[PDB]
Amino acid sequence: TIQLLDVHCEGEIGRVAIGGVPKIPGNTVAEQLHWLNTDPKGEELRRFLVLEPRGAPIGSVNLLLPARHPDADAAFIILQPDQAHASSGSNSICVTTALLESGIVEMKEPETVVTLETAAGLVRATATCRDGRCEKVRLTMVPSFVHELDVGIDTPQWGRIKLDLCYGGIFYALVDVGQIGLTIGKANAASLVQAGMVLKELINRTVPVVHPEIPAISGVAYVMFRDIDADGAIRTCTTMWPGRADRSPCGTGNSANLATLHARGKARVGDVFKSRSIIGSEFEVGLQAETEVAGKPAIIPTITGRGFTFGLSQVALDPFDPMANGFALTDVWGPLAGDI
Amino acid sequence: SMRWKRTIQLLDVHCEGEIGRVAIGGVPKIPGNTVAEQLHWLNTDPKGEELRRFLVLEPRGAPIGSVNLLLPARHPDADAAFIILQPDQAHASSGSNSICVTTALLESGIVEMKEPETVVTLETAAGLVRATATCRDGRCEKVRLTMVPSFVHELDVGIDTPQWGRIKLDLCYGGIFYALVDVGQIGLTIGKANAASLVQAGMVLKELINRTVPVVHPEIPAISGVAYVMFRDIDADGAIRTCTTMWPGRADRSPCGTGNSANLATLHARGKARVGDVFKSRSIIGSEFEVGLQAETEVAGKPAIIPTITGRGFTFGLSQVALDPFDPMANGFALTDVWGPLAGDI
């Protein structure tokens, strides 16, 4: 069996696999990510865990893996219906929360520094702990940077629109939502997701991207729509294949967006912003420092959010289930589910 | 992790792809001294809605699957009682979920497993369901349910629709009320590629029907309203192809036991099914049940039948959920991206 702690971060589910995880081939976490995304056994495992009947169209499964850096408490990789991913703020917060509240990592009060090894690098997480509860977690995200601002693409549905290509631990296309004639709110969840899936297909087909120093991280993962609320918060809706919205404000997406703000002169070291998701849940987003990635101007972002352990689950690793290969349908998985 | 926490313990089972989580420990006391009373309570009391919402909506629940609350048996012949929690309401009856419950009771050992066969009597708000389980080496391989008395209310009820014009449906009962609709009338076939469009049609029809076509069981007032619109067809091999659509908008993954029970009553009324007959039914994902006509009977003086439904349950995991009314999202939530077109009414 695989043992999971079921956690949500600002409404976004991150199941944290804390026991019974199989050995994942690779001498680095980046190699393990590559293996998961290329080997048939990697596909089999992911499908088994994420698709029906064992998985749901919402949430990710975070595989805890052996740390390699001596300062890392654990390593992890994020499993989703599309692929394995290197990075995620909401899931890093879920992993931190699970590690501390399970006692796998010793909880110190008022703060515990937890170090998570990802394919993108080490994520340093400062957890505010009180009375055995991990209340919130401030992530120091990996160096984030602009790939290109104001990229134009032709769309049959909305004509020419512009997006920012950028990196916040995985690659994003950021789109001002007014360009597709929608607004970010709950009532538009399906239509926003439909637009995001059209854009992701177009972008993935025509706009290849790879991290200049980490070959295993490539392609635009998600299209994130952005707007501004009246109180000044960065409103976001990250669209995820085969078609659903992130329930959290999106840590990696905010990290990538913060890099665009900094490039435009709209954010500076020391600034703190609020970001709000489609459901109104919130993160604090900070610009901690400037840096460089392979000669490119870059930043060190911070993402602060809360994790809530809501349950425990154990899944039988029985490959004889008649539904062991897993399935999905467009009723609840989104418009591209037929491609699963 | 859960130290110091109040939890509900569940066995996670699927029946032909349809998830039935079975709550076997830490279920709160549900007020009522009959199961029908407990069903009414869940569907009318604020605390009932609170509990259901907490368990079935995000972040704790997903848009697929049901939560089956095991409850004390009242009837002297019953081994256990249960009620089905879904995003729309609590429901009296479910074929797939009765199979999940039986599987979980027997494999956990809560009910003693006998080989080659164990009979488990489940008490529902609709009546007793006899579950005859084929068992071997500690596994409940498959379950034949004797369903509650099923009957026709009216065949070929006409209804005007803006999209498809006037169409016909059968109003009937298989442990809950159904509108059964030949799927050619909406210009779609039942298949995985049409899941979203079938569900959209099912929801339009459910809203129209619930507004204009009240129904109530003539002897069990707690069971009322058309629960589901089920689309039906016949495959090339003669299987009864089904797609039951569930509010706020998804398809049953199973062939639908209660829906097949209601459909079998319509076949019987049409002279197309007799005592002893057996049919196969297939779901939108191609999973299958055996559907039998065991006997004729009467419900409140009306002609009825006793159907059987045979399918397989499979325990895929265990889960525990913390009952924490102080979670900031204790009220639960849903969105139209994954919950279907009527999710905004949650």
Side-chain angles (χ1 to χ4, degrees), chain B residues 43-111:
Chain B
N43 285 331
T44 61
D45 195 88
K47 227 68 191 153
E49 174 144 67
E50 166 167 301
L51 175 60
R52 188 173 55 80
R53 284 183 67 99
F54 186 84
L55 294 172
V56 304
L57 299 180
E58 303 189 38
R60 289 156 287 283
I64 48 177
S66 305
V67 177
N68 299 294
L69 296 183
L70 289 181
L71 302 164
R74 303 297 165 173
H75 197 286
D77 297 346
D79 288 283
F82 80 106
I83 294 171
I84 305 104
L85 305 179
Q86 287 181 359
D88 58 335
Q89 58 177 94
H91 293 277
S93 310
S94 169
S96 303
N97 289 294
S98 302
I99 293 171
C100 288
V101 166
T102 303
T103 303
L105 286 170
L106 291 171
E107 294 187 351
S108 70
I110 290 166
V111 174

Side-chain angles (χ1 to χ4, degrees), chain B residues 19-31:
Chain B
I19 296 156
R21 303 176 77 197
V22 183
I24 61 165
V27 180
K29 207 173 199 314
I30 303 307

Side-chain angles (χ1 to χ4, degrees), chain A residues 168-180:
Chain A
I170 43 173
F171 283 101
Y172 279 85
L174 306 183
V175 180
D176 287 359
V177 78
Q179 289 184 102
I180 63 162

Side-chain angles (χ1 to χ4, degrees), chain A residues 217-242:
Chain A
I217 305 174
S218 63
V220 172
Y222 318 117
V223 172
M224 180 177 97
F225 295 110
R226 59 185 176 189
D227 206 342
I228 302 290
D229 287 340
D231 74 347
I234 300 159
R235 195 70 174 263
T236 71
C237 179
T238 295
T239 67
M240 314 170 65
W241 185 104

Side-chain angles (χ1 to χ4, degrees), chain B residues 30-45 48-49 52 69 71 82-86 89-93 123-127 173 175-176 217 220-224:
Chain B
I30 303 307
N33 280 296
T34 77
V35 181
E37 284 180 19
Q38 293 175 302
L39 176 68
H40 170 77
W41 187 91
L42 282 160
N43 285 331
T44 61
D45 195 88
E49 174 144 67
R52 188 173 55 80
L69 296 183
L71 302 164
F82 80 106
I83 294 171
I84 305 104
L85 305 179
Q86 287 181 359
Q89 58 177 94
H91 293 277
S93 310
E123 185 170 10
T124 71
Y173 180 81
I176 46 184
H217 195 283
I220 308 177
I223 302 179
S224 63

Side-chain angles (χ1 to χ4, degrees), chain B residues 191-208:
Chain B
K192 294 178 81 176
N194 290 329
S197 57
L198 288 161
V199 166
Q200 282 153 202
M203 290 307 96
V204 164
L205 291 168
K206 181 180 164 65
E207 294 300 86
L208 176 58

Side-chain angles (χ1 to χ4, degrees), chain B residues 261-273:
Chain B
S261 292
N263 188 64
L264 188 62
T266 74
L267 288 164
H268 177 258
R270 290 193 169 90
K272 297 179 187 295

